[PDB]
Amino acid sequence: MNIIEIKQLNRYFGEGENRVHVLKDISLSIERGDFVAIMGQSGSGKSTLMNIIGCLDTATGGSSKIDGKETIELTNDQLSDLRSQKFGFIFQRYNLLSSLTAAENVALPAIYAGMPQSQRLERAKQLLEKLGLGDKWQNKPNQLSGGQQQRVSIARALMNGGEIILADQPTGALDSHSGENVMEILRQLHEEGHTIIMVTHDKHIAASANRIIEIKDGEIISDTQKRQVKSAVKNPSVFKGKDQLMEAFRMSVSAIVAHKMRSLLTMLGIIIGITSVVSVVALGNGSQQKILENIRGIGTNTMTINLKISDANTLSKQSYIQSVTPNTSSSGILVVGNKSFTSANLYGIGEQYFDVEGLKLKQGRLLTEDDVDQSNQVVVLDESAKKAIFANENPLGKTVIFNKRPFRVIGVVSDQLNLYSPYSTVLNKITGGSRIGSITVKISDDVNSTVAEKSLTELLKSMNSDTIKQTIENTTGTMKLLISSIAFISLIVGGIGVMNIMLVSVTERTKEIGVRMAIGARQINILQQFLIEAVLICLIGGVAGILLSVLIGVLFNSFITDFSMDFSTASIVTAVLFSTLIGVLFGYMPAKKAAELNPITALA
Amino acid sequence: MNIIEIKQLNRYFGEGENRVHVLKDISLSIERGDFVAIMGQSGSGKSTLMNIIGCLDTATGGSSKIDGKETIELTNDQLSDLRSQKFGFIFQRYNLLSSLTAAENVALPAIYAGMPQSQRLERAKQLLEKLGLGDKWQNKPNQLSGGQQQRVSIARALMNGGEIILADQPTGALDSHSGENVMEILRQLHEEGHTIIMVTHDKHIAASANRIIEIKDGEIISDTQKRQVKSAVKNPSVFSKDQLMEAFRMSVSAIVAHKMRSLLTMLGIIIGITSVVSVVALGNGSQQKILENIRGIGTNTMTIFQNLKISDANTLSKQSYIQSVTPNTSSSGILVVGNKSFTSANLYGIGEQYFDVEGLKLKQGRLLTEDDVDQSNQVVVLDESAKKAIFANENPLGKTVIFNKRPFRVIGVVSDQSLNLYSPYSTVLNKITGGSRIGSITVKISDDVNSTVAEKSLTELLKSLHGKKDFFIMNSDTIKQTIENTTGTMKLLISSIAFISLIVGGIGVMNIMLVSVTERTKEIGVRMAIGARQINILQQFLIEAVLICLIGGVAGILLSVLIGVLFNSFITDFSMDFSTASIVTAVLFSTLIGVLFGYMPAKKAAELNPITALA
Ligand SMILES: Nc1ncnc2c1ncn2[C@@H]1O[C@H](COP(=O)(O)OP(=O)(O)OP(=O)(O)O)[C@@H](O)[C@H]1O
Ligand SMILES: Nc1ncnc2c1ncn2[C@@H]1O[C@H](COP(=O)(O)OP(=O)(O)OP(=O)(O)O)[C@@H](O)[C@H]1O
Ligand SMILES: [Mg+2]
């Protein structure tokens, strides 16, 4: 019967007293296949009505029915179908996408309809031939005149061949010639069974119409028909209960390439929120290695203990003991030159004593295994007892006399008169007797301290100094807190860094969605390309991230001598899975809230 | 004679093959005061010529002279004057500022002309009356119909009363009534001596002109005059505190209009401060605890291992680069308690402050006082180990020992770090060994003085009072080493992560800023076309920065403060100890960068041709 049936339709804008009655109880039935012109004084409610017809706004009250189906009661996907295939909207202000070419802007409504890419551009190119723009099919909106942008918009409305053609002042910026050709086009579509509803001020234009309504002050004044109207049986209907994503992907890429700055900055914001987190964890763990090492080297942790050499032999066969020393001393008198140093000390020590006490080799060598087996008369000198006896001259080789008994100096060591000879030499050639003073062991770095104090009580029956092993465990807990709490900062920092740039750059195209929704796209078609726009830009900025920090580590480890930046593969994972799980969340959230607005509200 | 003189004017766009010849050797002299209508096909070059006349574009080649003065040779502020006072431009696409009301948009061109704000709104309101929008003077562009937007544009163009009115399809979205009223307005201004150049497609509109030019394919086909032009009297030429006081008011409204952009940018600089500051202060705090844990593992000392007098060690202690001093002298002998008789014990004859020099701390009882060393007392302080062995697990305070058949009264115990015993040096040189010569002198080097400086400062300071040898100075300073060695490592740590976190949050501001302001390069192109001078842009975009920079700065320095308080409260261990040098550095950096990236873009826009900015 009718194709559009509007009864009691009211419309308000504003808050009140800031509110205005814009469409007032207007009741309008438009007959299928008619050619209608709507005229009226500027600001009378014409564009407002056109929107509620094309399902871009929604009326405050009253019914509006397309092919008798109440519009408000349709579903959101059902509406997107109408906008793709029954309606073909020519916007007053033409509403192109600025980043797309002319042709690309025309074909866009036909991607969401789902025709092959090759078919689109040839048709889109023909529509731009019919409307005089075949010359300018590659120009973008801002490379065209207004009258050209207008015709681009006209072509788009005709791309999906919609039954109805809503045309809001579609001649406005056009000369008489270009404007007639446009009326030629619309007339022939009327002739092929299309329905035309056209707002215009030019009368010659309105003459092509068989019906002419006049609106004034939100109400409808005139209603004129030249002829009766041919009857028409309604088209079947346009309702659609994988390739969709191939297209969504292509859109997302072109979108990203179009907005090089927003994209590059966005991804550069993810790049940092990774390399910053990663570089502080790796600088932190590198300065901890050195600091703990600088502490371990200030002295060792040891356990000084019927104590014969087979005790200290089996004691050295553990992995919780890394070195051992039999001990025995002597109090006597030395001689070099005429001088005779009295009450010197000759410490009878073990193979590994200079490892057990962390004394490091200055000059020459330390007591070898041959020296302790043969009870050699060779002495390693204390740094101090070496400078005092030999002034500032090489003492290597030269001899001393402890208890009228020669000793050949073989080396020097550090500190914490002192002399170091084997225990075999002091118990054979200085004191006699087979009993030794004590046994000292160097407890490992990893094993627990108070565990071994009771693991040695057990293992021998079958005192210990450990203040380094304390201030080690004590400063590893401080370096943990430090690294841990600055990693937490740099991570919260660079997440908010992503959020900001992502929130800004996306909301900055809420009108792009509003166009996409008006031209047929379904809600889900938006989320497709805006997720793909995020992950695609997040996991390129992530890759760039993990291997920009790598390059920083190399640069650091090359020029820096003090300590090495040692990376953590846990931080890498954390920082990446965080900076993308946050960038994707804030690239989707805003695009969705837009896609679920009334297109006109999104269009402002 | 002529008010506009355009000879040989050419114009191109693009890069061949993408290049197009748009205005082709067009010569056109327009007589002062005329009413001219330009017509032609869509995309023939009409809007392009209109822009070149109104000084929004500039021709590729040829001359274009307003009042006989060549335009390209004018200065960038001389042009900005023309656009405010000679031209009144009605844009094809109406080009309103979306965040301003209808009235605010119409008055704007009168800021940069410099008229008081109370007169602007009343005139702007009147222009909207004359054009029918007095009803809607508070509506923002997106609360208006297209035709209403159009009339707001027309109103704005008539706000500075410019001599020439360039109208690019001024009636296109208007019914015939509104459209005619607009023609009525233009016609009257013509009568009042204005000059009108109007692009249109409607012919009834074109009739209200005495001169009608038709352009096609960038050339001029038609040139018609109905009546001769009324003779022309040339008009007079038209070429900071307030200026700024207004710019500030624009910047505040601008900021409030873009609440998200603003809050996020300022939140961006908030972090770029609190992050830098909270890592400098977490780092310095953990250094304090780490360096302390090291210093507390032992001291640094210089033992001067005869010719060695107590007056040497007496003068030695009177420095500020020496904190304590000890005379030394030992004894090897035999002890007795009960029936037991411990062989080869050790009795260390030591000084008043020996337990501060080696950092040994007091367990129980007391240490050797000044009375004991002055009287050569027979009192001994016991080693923790030589205390537990001799007295099992019983209080040793008071009870006696016998070193070389000579009693000694125990007075206390010590920390540690054969049997070790501590007695005064006066007691060992009088009551155990005899002789007046001592073993050595040990000094405790101060924490702040350099080590190898003092090793050569005591060689000097003691030589000055004769007594050498010995001076065979040893120096145990491996603690003093492994503090300087980890303070350099903690320096490189806090220094390089403070550099990271700083460069991090500087880019974070750049991103959000470099987007936010380029996001309004068209807003500038409008302001430039509608009168503003180059400097007028930089004014409100600097004030937009500093005003949003030093609020997010204040927010930053005191958000970090609150984090510190939270950290120092819940964490026992190292305290977050702030630096007033980082506070300054971080703030003066995150604002100098946010201001540099708020200004840079705005200034690059404001020097583009207004039309190239409008795209
Ligand atoms: N940036 C650009 N690059 C290439 N060509 C351009 C560019 N801008 C405009 N053009 C072309 O130059 C011509 C200039 O048209 P102009 O802007 O003068 O429109 P017009 O003649 O007023 O048309 P209308 O009446 O439709 O507004 C057009 O043919 C247009 O396609
Ligand atoms: N968001 C809004 N808030 C308040 N009022 C509005 C809003 N949008 C539109 N209006 C008002 O509602 C009326 C309807 O405007 P509409 O766009 O329908 O005009 P129109 O009939 O298309 O006229 P034109 O021929 O100028 O396009 C106008 O008076 C306008 O001022
Ligand atoms: Mg309209």
Ligand SMILES: [Mg+2]
């Ligand atoms: Mg134009």
